[PDB]
Write a protein that binds this ligand. Sequence first.
Ligand code: HEM
Ligand SMILES: *[C@@H]1O[C@H](CO)[C@@H](O[C@@H]2O[C@H](CO)[C@@H](O[C@@H]3O[C@H](CO)[C@@H](O)[C@H](O)[C@@H]3O)[C@H](O)[C@H]2NC(C)=O)[C@H](O)[C@H]1NC(C)=O
Ligand SMILES: *[C@@H]1O[C@H](CO)[C@@H](O[C@@H]2O[C@H](CO)[C@@H](O)[C@H](O)[C@H]2NC(C)=O)[C@H](O)[C@H]1NC(C)=O
Ligand SMILES: *[C@@H]1O[C@H](CO)[C@@H](O[C@@H]2O[C@H](CO)[C@@H](O)[C@H](O)[C@H]2NC(C)=O)[C@H](O)[C@H]1NC(C)=O
Ligand SMILES: *[C@@H]1O[C@H](CO)[C@@H](O[C@@H]2O[C@H](CO)[C@@H](O)[C@H](O)[C@H]2NC(C)=O)[C@H](O)[C@H]1NC(C)=O
Ligand code: CA
Length: 595
Amino acid sequence: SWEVGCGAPVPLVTCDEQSPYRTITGDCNNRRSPALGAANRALARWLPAEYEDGLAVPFGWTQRKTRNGFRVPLAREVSNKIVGYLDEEGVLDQNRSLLFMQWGQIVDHDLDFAPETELGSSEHSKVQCEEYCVQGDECFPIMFPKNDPKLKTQGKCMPFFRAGFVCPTPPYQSLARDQINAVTSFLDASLVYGSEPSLASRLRNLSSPLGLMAVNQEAWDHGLAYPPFNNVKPSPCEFINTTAHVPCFQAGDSRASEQILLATVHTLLLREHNRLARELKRLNPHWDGEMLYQEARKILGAFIQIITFRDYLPIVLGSEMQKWIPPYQGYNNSVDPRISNVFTFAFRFGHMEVPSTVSRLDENYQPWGPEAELPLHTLFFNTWRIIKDGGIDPLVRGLLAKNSKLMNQNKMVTSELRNKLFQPTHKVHGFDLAAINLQRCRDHGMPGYNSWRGFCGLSQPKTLKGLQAVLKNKVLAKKLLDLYKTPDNIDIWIGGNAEPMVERGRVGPLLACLLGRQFQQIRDGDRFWWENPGVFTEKQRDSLQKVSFSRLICDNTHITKVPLHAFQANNYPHDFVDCSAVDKLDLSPWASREN
Ligand code: HEM
Ligand SMILES: *[C@@H]1O[C@H](CO)[C@@H](O[C@@H]2O[C@H](CO)[C@@H](O[C@@H]3O[C@H](CO)[C@@H](O)[C@H](O)[C@@H]3O)[C@H](O)[C@H]2NC(C)=O)[C@H](O)[C@H]1NC(C)=O
Ligand SMILES: *[C@@H]1O[C@H](CO)[C@@H](O[C@@H]2O[C@H](CO)[C@@H](O)[C@H](O)[C@H]2NC(C)=O)[C@H](O)[C@H]1NC(C)=O
Ligand SMILES: *[C@@H]1O[C@H](CO)[C@@H](O[C@@H]2O[C@H](CO)[C@@H](O)[C@H](O)[C@H]2NC(C)=O)[C@H](O)[C@H]1NC(C)=O
Ligand SMILES: *[C@@H]1O[C@H](CO)[C@@H](O[C@@H]2O[C@H](CO)[C@@H](O)[C@H](O)[C@H]2NC(C)=O)[C@H](O)[C@H]1NC(C)=O
Ligand SMILES: [Ca+2]
C-alpha cells in the first residue's frame, strides 16, 4: 500500500548524536526514524482520504457526481444559511480574554501550515481563477448561490486555490493526495525561529555575538523593538494604506502579519528572545554567539510548551483534559509526533472565537483616543496601526481586558470574518472564511462528520432526530441536513463546531477528542519536551515553572498593571495588579562558570 511516502524537501540533513539542541527543520528528534516530525512533508492520516475520483478530486468538483447519492452543498451557501449572524450584541465569552483566542493561533501556527499552491507567478491561472471563475487545474473556486448579495457586488466566485501536495508540486496522478506541512510538528517556537534553515539564519543578527534575533532599524516602540520588515514588494500590508507605506513584519512564519493582534503577541515572543539572550551573556560571558541563540531558543520553546499545556489546554478541553492528556510519564520513541490532516481543521475552532472589534486602551485601561475601537476587517495585514498608531502597549492592554467571542449555535463566525476577509494575493475585503474553510476540507481529505464520530467511538447519527439529540438544537439539525441531506456528508469543520460544548471547556465531544489526541501525541513524542529528563537540569525546570504570559508582558512592555490570570475574563481596576506581585523567571541555574 506504501509507495513509499515519496517526498522532496530539504534535500540534505544528517544528525548530531550528542548535541542538546533541536534542529530548525525538526529532523533528528526521533533517532530511529529521523524525518518523523519534520517540515515540508505530508500531513498524517488517521483515516483514509475521501475523494471523488478516488485519489485527488474533491467532492463537488464535477456536477453529475455525488457523495453517497446526494449533491454536496456549496460552501458559501452552507455558510450563508448556518454560520453568519447580524446581531453582535451579547456574544462575548464571560470567562475568556482575547488572549485566549490569541494564544490559540500562536500554538496552532507553531504546529501546522499547508501552503497554498502557487505554481503561479507572471501568470494567467491566477487570472483565470480571479477573472473568469473557471474551475480546473488548481483553481477550485467558491461559487455564489442564488440571491447572495456578493453577486451584485463582486462577481460569480471567490477565487480559491488548492493546497500543496507531495512527491511533486506539478500536475500528477497516483496514490492518495496528502497535503504538505511547511512547519515543524513540535511545540518548538517554529513561528519565532523559522522552519527552513535558510530563513532561520536571516532573522538573526550575526553582526554581533550576543546571539540576538535581528530587529527593526527604522521603527521603534519606546526603546522596545519590532520584528524586521519583509522588504519584498508587493506587500499585503502596504496595499491597505499606501500613504504610509509600511510593509509586513518578518518572522519565523509567513502569517505573522495576517492580523494586528497576531503581530502583537508575536512581537512579545521576539522581544523575549533578545531579553533572555541578553541576560544570558550577563551570567556567562564566556559563551560564543550560537550558544547564546541556542540556549535562549530552548528556554523560549519551554515557555510556549508550559503555557500551552498548563493554562490553555485545560480551559479549552475541560472535563475531557484528563481523558486525553493524562499526566506525563516520560518519552515514547514509538509515538507519531506529526500533525494529522484533520487537526488542521479541528483546531480552526478558534475562528468562532474572534469578536467583531479590536480595541486599544490607554494607561488606565480606558479607551485610547477618538477611534479606540476598530472593526476587525480594517485590521487584516495592518502594520501601520502599530508602527504609526501608538505601539503595542494599547493592544496588549486590550488583550488582557477585553472578552473574546463565545461560540454560539445561532451566532457562529462574525461577519467581519465571514464577509469582509482580506486575502493577501487579492485586492478586495470580501472573502469568506467560513466558506473558504468548507472547500478546504473537500480539498484536503476529508472524511465526513460520522467517520470522525466513529474514530472517537461516539454516536454516529443517521436521522433528523439522531442529530437533534446530539447538537441539542432542532432548528440547527434541520438546517444542517436540509443542505447535506444525510448526517454523513457534513464537513467536519461545521459538524464538529455545531455540537454544544463539553463541561468547563470551549469545544465539544468530537473536537475535544481530535484535539486531545494530537496534543498528547506531540507531547509524548517530542524528545525535547521540557519535562523529559535530560533536556533541562532539575533546577532549571523549577524556574521554568514560575513563568506566565502575565510576565511575558511585564519584561517586554510598559504595561505595569496586569491580571494574575491572563487567560480568563477579569476587570480593571479590581482583578489587575502590579508587575511586582507576579513571579519572575530566575535565570541563575543557567550559569556555568568555566573553571
Ligand atoms: C482575525 C483572526 C484570524 C484571521 C484573520 C485568520 C486568518 C486565516 C486565514 C486567511 C487562513 C487560511 C485558510 C486556508 O487557506 O487554509 C487561516 C488558517 C488557519 N487558522 Fe486562522 N486566522 C485568525 C485567527 C485564528 C485563531 C485564533 C486560530 C486558533 C485559535 C486560528 C487557526 C487556524 C489554523 C489551524 C489554520 C490552518 C493553518 C494550517 O495550515 O495549519 N486562526 N487563518
Ligand atoms: C545587532 O546587534 C547590534 C548590537 O547590539 C545592534 O546595534 C546596536 O543598536 C543599538 C540600538 O539599536 C544602538 O544604540 C544606541 O544607538 C543610538 C542611535 O543609533 C545612539 O543614540 C546611542 O549612542 C546608542 O549607542 C547601537 O548603536 C548599536 N550598538 C552597537 C555596539 O553597535 C544592531 O542593530 C543589531 N542588528 C539587527 C539587525 O538587529
Ligand atoms: C472561569 O474559568 C476559570 C478557568 O477555567 C475557572 O477556574 C478553574 O477552576 C477549576 C476547577 O477546580 C480548576 O481546575 C482551576 O483551579 C481554575 N483555573 C485556574 C486557571 O485557576 C473558574 O471557575 C471560572 N469562573 C467562574 C465564575 O465560573
Ligand atoms: C494612512 O496612514 C496614515 C498614518 O501613516 C493615517 O494618517 C493619520 O490620519 C489622521 C486623519 O487623516 C491624522 O489626524 C493623523 O495625524 C495621521 N497620522 C499621520 C502622522 O499621518 C491615515 O489616516 C491613513 N489613511 C488611510 C488610507 O486609511
Ligand atoms: C508508547 O505509547 C504507545 C501508544 O500509547 C504504547 O503502544 C501500545 O503498546 C501496547 C503493548 O506494547 C500495544 O498493545 C498497542 O499496540 C499500543 N497501544 C495503543 C492503543 O496504541 C506503548 O505501550 C508505549 N511504549 C512503552 C513500551 O512504554
Ligand atoms: Ca512547531
